[PDB]
Symmetry: C2
Subunit: 153 residues, 2 copies
């Protein structure tokens, strides 16, 4: 992935997000409710020291679990460590595009986050333009009804 947000202000991504669309390099990363990168973002809580705490949902044992993780800051403002989290682009008000990647061929998953339970075509376009550069083999998108549901059921 060689798109990062120039001049990311991590404090300003704080609060409510909706995982509107997801994509991944391998179908097995997103295909089942329990697929490893099938993670539904709920809220981003950046620390004063500039780390990013993430609240998300995960279908684990036939159940929508609430989960909590801290992404540790790096020397690059748009890159955090868990396995790396890269912030591609955000207007802070509406949408945020991010990817997660490991080290191996690498696993890669990217989401289009939006602030509201609405299909934002403009954001989905930017998400698709960003993905053109990337070797994705599965893409998912969610309707407004599903965005208001635990684990988007």
């Amino acid at each position: 992935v060689t798109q990062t947000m120039k001049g990311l202000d991590i404090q300003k991504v704080a609060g409510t997000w909706y995982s509107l669309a997801m994509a991944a390099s391998d179908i097995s990363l997103l295909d089942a409710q329990s697929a490893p990168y099938r993670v539904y973002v709920e809220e981003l809580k950046p620390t004063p020291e500039g780390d990013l705490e993430i609240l998300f949902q995960k279908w684990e044992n036939g159940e929508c679990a609430q989960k909590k993780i801290i992404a540790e800051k790096t020397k690059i403002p748009a890159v955090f460590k868990i396995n790396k989290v890269l912030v591609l682009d955000t207007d802070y008000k509406k949408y945020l595009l991010f990817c997660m990647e490991n080290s191996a061929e690498q696993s890669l998953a990217c989401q289009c986050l939006v602030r509201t339970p609405e299909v934002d075509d403009e954001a989905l376009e930017k998400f698709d333009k960003a993905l053109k550069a990337l070797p994705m083999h599965i893409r998912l998108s969610f309707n407004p009804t599903q965005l208001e549901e635990q684990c988007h059921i």
Copy 2:
């Protein structure tokens, strides 16, 4: 779906095809190996009377089953009945885009078929342009290795 192939010559789609990409209106139509519209085209055998016999693979009971169905012709050369099959576009030599649709909100699945076990970017573009008009919520694509495998494993 309001894109059909003008002047389709069904005889000329005869032979070997590869399901390179699939998309559907609902994630549950494609998400699992056993999802109902997760069908891998192998060969099209059009009848003299102008019907279309389809050989495909389907993961059913933990197994890649070989399956056989006849799509019956209609008054529209680009539309067959099984549940309707619509042929969107084909250059006969390289690619064929088709959709399958039921009657209800309708289930809708579309594929980009190619003649060879190769990622055809030009065909994938035409597939994506055709899908822009359609309410798809899952997209899959397969690599050359998977195209040579039963049920694309």
